[PDB]
Design a protein around this motif. Structure first.
Motif, PDB file in Angstrom:
ATOM      1  N   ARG A  41      46.986  -1.581  59.728  1.00  0.00           N
ATOM      2  CA  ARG A  41      45.818  -0.684  59.839  1.00  0.00           C
ATOM      3  C   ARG A  41      46.043   0.784  59.384  1.00  0.00           C
ATOM      4  O   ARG A  41      47.172   1.296  59.358  1.00  0.00           O
ATOM      5  N   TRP A  42      44.953   1.432  58.990  1.00  0.00           N
ATOM      6  CA  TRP A  42      44.971   2.828  58.541  1.00  0.00           C
ATOM      7  C   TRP A  42      43.725   3.527  59.092  1.00  0.00           C
ATOM      8  O   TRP A  42      42.788   2.852  59.543  1.00  0.00           O
ATOM      9  N   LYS A  43      43.764   4.862  59.127  1.00  0.00           N
ATOM     10  CA  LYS A  43      42.631   5.670  59.583  1.00  0.00           C
ATOM     11  C   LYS A  43      42.163   6.402  58.320  1.00  0.00           C
ATOM     12  O   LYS A  43      42.996   6.780  57.499  1.00  0.00           O
ATOM     13  N   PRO A  44      40.829   6.596  58.162  1.00  0.00           N
ATOM     14  CA  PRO A  44      40.250   7.386  57.043  1.00  0.00           C
ATOM     15  C   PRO A  44      40.512   8.894  57.257  1.00  0.00           C
ATOM     16  O   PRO A  44      40.549   9.345  58.401  1.00  0.00           O
ATOM     17  N   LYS A  45      40.727   9.659  56.192  1.00  0.00           N
ATOM     18  CA  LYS A  45      41.034  11.085  56.322  1.00  0.00           C
ATOM     19  C   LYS A  45      40.566  11.816  55.042  1.00  0.00           C
ATOM     20  O   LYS A  45      40.742  11.279  53.918  1.00  0.00           O
ATOM     21  N   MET A  46      39.930  12.988  55.202  1.00  0.00           N
ATOM     22  CA  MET A  46      39.646  13.853  54.053  1.00  0.00           C
ATOM     23  C   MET A  46      40.707  14.963  53.949  1.00  0.00           C
ATOM     24  O   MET A  46      41.001  15.679  54.909  1.00  0.00           O
ATOM     25  N   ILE A  47      41.303  15.105  52.775  1.00  0.00           N
ATOM     26  CA  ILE A  47      42.239  16.199  52.593  1.00  0.00           C
ATOM     27  C   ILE A  47      41.828  17.062  51.421  1.00  0.00           C
ATOM     28  O   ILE A  47      41.446  16.550  50.350  1.00  0.00           O
ATOM     29  N   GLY A  48      41.983  18.373  51.620  1.00  0.00           N
ATOM     30  CA  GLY A  48      41.493  19.389  50.712  1.00  0.00           C
ATOM     31  C   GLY A  48      42.486  20.007  49.727  1.00  0.00           C
ATOM     32  O   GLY A  48      43.666  20.171  50.024  1.00  0.00           O
ATOM     33  N   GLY A  49      41.974  20.361  48.547  1.00  0.00           N
ATOM     34  CA  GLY A  49      42.742  21.086  47.545  1.00  0.00           C
ATOM     35  C   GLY A  49      41.803  22.162  47.074  1.00  0.00           C
ATOM     36  O   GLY A  49      40.728  22.298  47.637  1.00  0.00           O
ATOM     37  N   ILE A  50      42.172  22.899  46.034  1.00  0.00           N
ATOM     38  CA  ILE A  50      41.348  24.031  45.539  1.00  0.00           C
ATOM     39  C   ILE A  50      39.893  23.712  45.213  1.00  0.00           C
ATOM     40  O   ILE A  50      39.029  24.553  45.418  1.00  0.00           O
ATOM     41  N   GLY A  51      39.632  22.542  44.648  1.00  0.00           N
ATOM     42  CA  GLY A  51      38.299  22.188  44.160  1.00  0.00           C
ATOM     43  C   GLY A  51      37.524  21.175  45.000  1.00  0.00           C
ATOM     44  O   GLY A  51      36.517  20.663  44.533  1.00  0.00           O
ATOM     45  N   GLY A  52      37.987  20.864  46.216  1.00  0.00           N
ATOM     46  CA  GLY A  52      37.309  19.854  47.057  1.00  0.00           C
ATOM     47  C   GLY A  52      38.198  18.873  47.839  1.00  0.00           C
ATOM     48  O   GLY A  52      39.373  19.147  48.090  1.00  0.00           O
ATOM     49  N   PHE A  53      37.616  17.733  48.231  1.00  0.00           N
ATOM     50  CA  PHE A  53      38.274  16.740  49.084  1.00  0.00           C
ATOM     51  C   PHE A  53      38.525  15.390  48.395  1.00  0.00           C
ATOM     52  O   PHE A  53      37.671  14.884  47.630  1.00  0.00           O
ATOM     53  N   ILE A  54      39.713  14.844  48.663  1.00  0.00           N
ATOM     54  CA  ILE A  54      40.076  13.467  48.343  1.00  0.00           C
ATOM     55  C   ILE A  54      40.039  12.650  49.667  1.00  0.00           C
ATOM     56  O   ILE A  54      40.526  13.120  50.718  1.00  0.00           O
ATOM     57  N   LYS A  55      39.455  11.454  49.628  1.00  0.00           N
ATOM     58  CA  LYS A  55      39.578  10.513  50.755  1.00  0.00           C
ATOM     59  C   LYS A  55      40.889   9.707  50.609  1.00  0.00           C
ATOM     60  O   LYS A  55      41.205   9.190  49.515  1.00  0.00           O
ATOM     61  N   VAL A  56      41.633   9.612  51.710  1.00  0.00           N
ATOM     62  CA  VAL A  56      42.891   8.867  51.733  1.00  0.00           C
ATOM     63  C   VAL A  56      42.932   7.933  52.932  1.00  0.00           C
ATOM     64  O   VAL A  56      42.074   8.006  53.826  1.00  0.00           O
ATOM     65  N   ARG A  57      43.916   7.040  52.938  1.00  0.00           N
ATOM     66  CA  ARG A  57      44.169   6.175  54.092  1.00  0.00           C
ATOM     67  C   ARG A  57      45.395   6.709  54.823  1.00  0.00           C
ATOM     68  O   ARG A  57      46.470   6.923  54.222  1.00  0.00           O
ATOM     69  N   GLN A  58      45.232   6.970  56.105  1.00  0.00           N
ATOM     70  CA  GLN A  58      46.328   7.550  56.838  1.00  0.00           C
ATOM     71  C   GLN A  58      47.172   6.438  57.489  1.00  0.00           C
ATOM     72  O   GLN A  58      46.651   5.656  58.312  1.00  0.00           O
ATOM     73  N   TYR A  59      48.450   6.345  57.107  1.00  0.00           N
ATOM     74  CA  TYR A  59      49.371   5.352  57.730  1.00  0.00           C
ATOM     75  C   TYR A  59      50.370   6.009  58.665  1.00  0.00           C
ATOM     76  O   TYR A  59      51.167   6.824  58.221  1.00  0.00           O
TER      77      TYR A  59
END
Ligand SMILES: COc1cc([C@@H]2Nc3ccccc3NC3=C2C(=O)C[C@@H](c2ccccc2)C3)cc(Cl)c1O
Ligand SMILES: COc1cc([C@@H]2Nc3ccccc3NC3=C2C(=O)C[C@@H](c2ccccc2)C3)cc(Cl)c1O
Ligand SMILES: [Cl-]
Lengths: 99, 99
Positions: A41-59
């Motif tokens: 299993r993984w949890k959904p997470k938004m992570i930010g950089g200069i121009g916006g957010f990437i969605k990732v899977r948190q393990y």
């Protein structure tokens, strides 16, 4: 080991039976690795950089290895322009900045 | 000094007579600092991160001091969510990663 900064601090990171090249990144809280298939299993997470957010899977609670040093921590899996090992794993291998 | 990575590696830097806080960032090639007034001529540049590119001004031969270590090099000025000391300057002051 001692890693110079005369070029990018690139290492092989092992997670289970998968090998990835990654950039040692003291400028990042978290570890983000692109395109890998961890089980369970993984949890959904938004992570930010200069121009916006990437969605990732948190393990969470993943066994990793870097240059003969084992560590346990969270890996974020998602699209990144480069694979980065943030401080969450840098501290777990006992890595410091020295000058 | 030795800088552990339990907290973000934020240091004070002296640049153009002023003290600023900056992140020591082994994940970046280049040094990027919030808009400040630097004297003299500059070269236009675009630097990428997540989602796009930020317009910056490139200044060469800038005296910058970090924790006693005086360096001379290239600083990029423009919008950034955090002042970053990149490898160009980190390697200049003999910074390494050690574990
Ligand atoms: C210390 O404060 C910050 C640190 C950072 C971290 N260091 C950077 C410093 C200056 C400019 C930009 C980055 N960028 C990234 C960083 C990360 O920790 C996550 C990283 C990322 C990787 C893959 C996919 C998405 C995102 C983007 C970012 C922001 Cl927005 C900060 O406010
Ligand atoms: C080694 O390869 C890369 C390294 C980096 C550098 N490290 C990051 C590693 C992973 C994800 C994102 C960042 N982001 C930033 C980085 C920079 O070197 C410049 C920085 C910045 C600061 C202020 C204003 C604009 C940009 C944004 C980015 C990209 Cl896109 C790479 O391909
Ligand atoms: Cl970014």
């Amino acid at each position: 080991p001692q890693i110079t900064l005369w070029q990018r601090p690139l290492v092989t990171i092992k997670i289970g039976g998968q090998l990835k090249e990654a950039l040692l990144d003291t400028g990042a809280d978290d570890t983000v690795l692109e395109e890998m298939s961890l089980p369970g299993r993984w949890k959904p997470k938004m992570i930010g950089g200069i121009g916006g957010f990437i969605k990732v899977r948190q393990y969470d609670q993943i066994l990793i290895e870097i240059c003969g040093h084992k560590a346990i921590g969270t890996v974020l899996v998602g699209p990144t322009p480069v694979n980065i090992i943030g401080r969450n794993l840098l501290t777990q291998i006992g890595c410091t900045l020295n000058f």
